[PDB]
Amino acid sequence: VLLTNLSEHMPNDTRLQTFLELAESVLNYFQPFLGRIEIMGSAKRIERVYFEISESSRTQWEKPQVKESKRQFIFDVVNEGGEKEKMELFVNFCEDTIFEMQLAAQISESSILTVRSALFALRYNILTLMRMLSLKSLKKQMKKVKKMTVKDMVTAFFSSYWSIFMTLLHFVASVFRGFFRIIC
Amino acid sequence: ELRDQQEQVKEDMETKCFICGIGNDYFDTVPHGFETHTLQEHNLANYLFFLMYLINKDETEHTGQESYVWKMYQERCWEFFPAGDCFRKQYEDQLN
Amino acid sequence: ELRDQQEQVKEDMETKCFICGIGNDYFDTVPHGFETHTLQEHNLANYL
Amino acid sequence: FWKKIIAYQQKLLNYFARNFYNMRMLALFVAFAINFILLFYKVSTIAVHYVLEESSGYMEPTLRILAILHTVISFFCIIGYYCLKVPLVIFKREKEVARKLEFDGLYITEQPSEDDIKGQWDRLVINTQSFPNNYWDKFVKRKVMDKYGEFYGRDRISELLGMDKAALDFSDAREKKKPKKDSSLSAVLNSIDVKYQMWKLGVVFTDNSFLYLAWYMTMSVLGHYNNFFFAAHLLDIAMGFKTLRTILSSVTHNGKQLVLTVGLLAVVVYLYTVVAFNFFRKFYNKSEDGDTPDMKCDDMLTCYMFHMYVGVRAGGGIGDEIEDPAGDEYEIYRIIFDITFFFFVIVILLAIIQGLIIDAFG
Amino acid sequence: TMSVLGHYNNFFFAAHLLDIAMGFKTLRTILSSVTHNGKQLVLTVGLLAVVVYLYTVVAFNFFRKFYNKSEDGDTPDMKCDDMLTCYMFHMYVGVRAGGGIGDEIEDPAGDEYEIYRIIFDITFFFFVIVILLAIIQGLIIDAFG
Ligand SMILES: Nc1ncnc2c1ncn2[C@@H]1O[C@H](COP(=O)(O)OP(=O)(O)OP(=O)(O)O)[C@@H](O)[C@H]1O
Ligand SMILES: Nc1ncnc2c1ncn2[C@@H]1O[C@H](COP(=O)(O)OP(=O)(O)OP(=O)(O)O)[C@@H](O)[C@H]1O
Numbered sequence A: 001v002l003l004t005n006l007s008e009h010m011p012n013d014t015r016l017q018t019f020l021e022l023a024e025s026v027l028n029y030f031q032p033f034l035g036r037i038e039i040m041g042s043a044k045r046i047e048r049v050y051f052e053i054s055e056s057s058r059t060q061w062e063k064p065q066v067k068e069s070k071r072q073f074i075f076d077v078v079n080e081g082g083e084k085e086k087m088e089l090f091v092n093f094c095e096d097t098i099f100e101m102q103l104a105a106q107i108s109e110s111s112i113l114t115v116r117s118a119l120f121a122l123r124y125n126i127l128t129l130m131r132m133l134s135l136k137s138l139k140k141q142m143k144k145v146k147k148m149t150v151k152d153m154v155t156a157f158f159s160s161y162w163s164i165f166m167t168l169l170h171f172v173a174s175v176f177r178g179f180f181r182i183i184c
Numbered sequence B: 001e002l003r004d005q006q007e008q009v010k011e012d013m014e015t016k017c018f019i020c021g022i023g024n025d026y027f028d029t030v031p032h033g034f035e036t037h038t039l040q041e042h043n044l045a046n047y048l049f050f051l052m053y054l055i056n057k058d059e060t061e062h063t064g065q066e067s068y069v070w071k072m073y074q075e076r077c078w079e080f081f082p083a084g085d086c087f088r089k090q091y092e093d094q095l096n
Numbered sequence C: 001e002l003r004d005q006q007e008q009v010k011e012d013m014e015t016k017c018f019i020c021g022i023g024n025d026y027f028d029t030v031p032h033g034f035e036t037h038t039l040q041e042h043n044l045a046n047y048l
Numbered sequence D: 001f002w003k004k005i006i007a008y009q010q011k012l013l014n015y016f017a018r019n020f021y022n023m024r025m026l027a028l029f030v031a032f033a034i035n036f037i038l039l040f041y042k043v044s045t046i047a048v049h050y051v052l053e054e055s056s057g058y059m060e061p062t063l064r065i066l067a068i069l070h071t072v073i074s075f076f077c078i079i080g081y082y083c084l085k086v087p088l089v090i091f092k093r094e095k096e097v098a099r100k101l102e103f104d105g106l107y108i109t110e111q112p113s114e115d116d117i118k119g120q121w122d123r124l125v126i127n128t129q130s131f132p133n134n135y136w137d138k139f140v141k142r143k144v145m146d147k148y149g150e151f152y153g154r155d156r157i158s159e160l161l162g163m164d165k166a167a168l169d170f171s172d173a174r175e176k177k178k179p180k181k182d183s184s185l186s187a188v189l190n191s192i193d194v195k196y197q198m199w200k201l202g203v204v205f206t207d208n209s210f211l212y213l214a215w216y217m218t219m220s221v222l223g224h225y226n227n228f229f230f231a232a233h234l235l236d237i238a239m240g241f242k243t244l245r246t247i248l249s250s251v252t253h254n255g256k257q258l259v260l261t262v263g264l265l266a267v268v269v270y271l272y273t274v275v276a277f278n279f280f281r282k283f284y285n286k287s288e289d290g291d292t293p294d295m296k297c298d299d300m301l302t303c304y305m306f307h308m309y310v311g312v313r314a315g316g317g318i319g320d321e322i323e324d325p326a327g328d329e330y331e332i333y334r335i336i337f338d339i340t341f342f343f344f345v346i347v348i349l350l351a352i353i354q355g356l357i358i359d360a361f362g
Numbered sequence E: 001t002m003s004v005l006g007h008y009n010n011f012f013f014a015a016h017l018l019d020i021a022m023g024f025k026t027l028r029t030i031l032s033s034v035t036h037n038g039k040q041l042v043l044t045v046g047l048l049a050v051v052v053y054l055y056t057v058v059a060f061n062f063f064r065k066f067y068n069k070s071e072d073g074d075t076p077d078m079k080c081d082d083m084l085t086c087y088m089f090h091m092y093v094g095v096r097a098g099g100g101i102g103d104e105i106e107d108p109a110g111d112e113y114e115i116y117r118i119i120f121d122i123t124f125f126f127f128v129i130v131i132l133l134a135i136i137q138g139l140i141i142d143a144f145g
């Protein structure tokens, strides 16, 4: 807190920058726990205040129902709330939120199968297509492709995609079968 | 009407700070200035945490600023909240 | 249209003074300045 | 030999990629033609023989030719998709995997959720020797090695990413090697990376648009066995025409709200059915002959189906269909029943649907 | 030309009542709501015809027995024995009916396709009668706004 106060009140100071790098780790650790607000002080000036935010308080604030309460309060104070009473409504909301967060801290006492089935279907149905490469079909086709044939080339190029589409159909069928067997 | 009210809430929160009420343009004269101001300098969550800290802290143990805010809060007086002013406006020339 | 007209009336009255017509921001450079100006300095009831 | 065959293959790939959209539009035009021909398709008679009536006598060969052409065009459209749109999907997927490896360490510091099919499948592509095949940044492996190698182990990162210490260092040093022959078909097959192809095939199969085109192809094929399957291709106008997409956005913008409004309607109608089944069963006779009484509310399921089917569709509510309550000791209660049914179900809920669509437009 | 033809047939003078759109500008303001989204309205009508054609295909393949429209048993009047006849029936008698095609077709009670036909009628009512007409309504209201 001392170092942060000094850094913010002396923005351009290389000597202070050095200590900031030396204390980066400590500041990184205490960054979540360090609070910072601005108030109009007794000297009729805007003063910045540093305090401590606790881990329990932050977790209770980040719990979803508290976020819903915050959203509802902002909606209300923006739509029907007035400017003259805004800071009174905000303080009342803060008090209620603080009480409920303390109560929650007090009361607190110290699909995967479908994904796996889909992965298995993908692996099986793609290995089925990949086994077509080691069947020595290419070795046998070498002698027959020694002679060039444009029609043969186009036919094979179409047949590759036809096989791909057939494998996709098999994948869809396998996924449906596995999903039904699971839900049964 | 409900849709328009939600849009109005979003626009107000995106274009002016909840606490001070200054527009986003003045803060955005510095890059990322508006969200920096609304998440570090004038965060409403920070004010709520300060109220919790000030309530839970012992009365004898308060510092001068804490005692000042505490007495104004007890007497229900909300001028410690910055209205139309901030650190960047107090020290505009010194900061840059 | 009726709803939009009511919203326009509310927005105009909340963002500019009825008499002088100056925006709320200039008055709000001082805390509570806009409502201070519209309730003490340039109140239409005061003119009436 | 390769210099000409691979060039011809690339020519075909480029042609299909260029003409993908034209083939997509021609596939819709041909489907519209087939359905227009099918609008002249009658039942001729036991066994039901669907027969195409024609004074000209020419429309049936036209139907067969159009069906064959539609199937061929549908196959060409999926080929064009694989030639043109798949590389963008692979590029995006590879980019995401690389950036989650680098700036998140999603396979080093943290692990996929084990319910994220994308992460579990992308686990495979990291070890492949042909990674950033589409993404420009070829140095992702080295970047991750620099970032996480000293902390989690240089060697460990090496087997995780497929990098080879024993080969890289001695290849940088003096190592005698022998190159392959392009004329060697065995070498040509050895060049391919099977695992990366497996990953790519998985990504393509998981792609939504590829699945839609496969469904299009399957329906086109089934159209030969039953010509009326070609009517399913008229559903493609939503993607074919963008103003249709603008119109349908009004419905789809608030789809969750519409579904929940329908569910709320079913709940309210069920409550009304409970009330009718407990008090107003005598009024649900729907048979004119006195010999045969047809009770539509003697059973819970029958009464609920009656209210959902005959009641909601009726413009005056369930009272338009149920008996007259005149001169009965439940007359006022049943009048309240009918009026409230009409006001809540017929007037308000349908108004909610109307307002949802109009609000989506606005 | 219409004024001249009115002398041969006096009822041609009724065509000149179409000039009120240009004569009165508030009529132009009212008609702008329709004409502002005319392309959307035409495409909505086309989409309605496509959806009704799909329903006609389903009915012609499965629910032909329920389209008798003649009371006398001697004369069976099938309205879905032919593709064109069934489509015209669905577009004419079905869309205009407030309860969908089920208001006009036979009763599905006690049949082995009962639940399928109930789904058919309910979906027809929900999509054609409720949603598409709501799309037209919303288009006009959006043009106004
Ligand atoms: N004083 C303020 N404190 C915090 N946010 C403010 C303030 N003034 C304006 N804002 C705006 O509110 C936004 C934050 O909105 P909000 O507090 O509702 O939560 P969020 O970031 O949207 O998410 P969540 O609801 O999940 O916590 C900021 O990004 C900023 O634009
Ligand atoms: N010249 C002005 N005089 C008074 N109010 C003004 C003037 N210019 C703007 N306003 C705005 O009008 C608001 C007052 O509104 P208005 O005079 O309609 O009555 P009100 O305070 O809302 O309540 P009530 O209708 O019960 O008297 C002020 O708060 C201010 O925001």
Ligand SMILES: [Zn+2]
Residues within 6 Å of the ligand: B017, B018, B019, B020, B021, B022, B037, B038, B041, B042, B086
């Ligand atoms: Zn602020």
Ligand SMILES: [Zn+2]
Residues within 6 Å of the ligand: C017, C018, C019, C020, C021, C022, C037, C038, C041, C042
């Ligand atoms: Zn004024």
